[PDB]
């Protein structure tokens, strides 16, 4: 996977943007929020 944590998001809209982190560009992760999979910039614990 890619490092970092997924950021907090609202649960909707129920879109699916991605299969896995590699679906997403650059450092972005494929983050699940229930009914939603969204590409997000991660939060690094630094």
Swiss-Prot record:
Similarity field: Belongs to the venom waprin family.
Single GO BP term: venom-mediated disruption of cell wall in another organism
Cell location: Secreted
UniProt superkingdom: Eukaryota
Note: A D-omwaprin has been synthesized to permit cristallization by using a racemic mixture containing equal amounts of L- and D-omwaprin. This D-omwaprin provokes B.megaterium lysis (after 45 minutes of treatment), but fails to inhibit growth of B.anthracis.
Name of the protein this chain belongs to: Omwaprin-a
Single GO MF annotation: peptidase inhibitor activity
Any one of the GO CC terms: extracellular region
Keyword Transcription recorded: no
Function: Damages membranes of susceptible bacteria. Has antibacterial activity against the Gram-positive bacteria B.megaterium and S.warneri. After a 45-minute treatment with this protein, B.megaterium have no visible pili and are smooth. Has no antibacterial activity against the Gram-positive bacteria B.thuringiensis, S.aureus, S.clavuligerus and B.anthracis, or the Gram-negative bacteria E.coli and A.tumefaciens. Has no hemolytic activity. Does not inhibit the proteinases elastase and cathepsin G. Is not toxic to mice.
Keywords per UniProt: Antibiotic, Antimicrobial, Disulfide bond, Secreted
């Amino acid at each position: 996977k890619k490092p970092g944590l997924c950021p907090p998001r609202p649960q909707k809209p129920c879109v699916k943007e991605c299969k896995n982190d590699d679906s997403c560009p650059g450092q972005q992760k494929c983050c699940n929020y229930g009914c939603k999979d969204e590409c997000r910039d991660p939060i690094f614990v630094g």
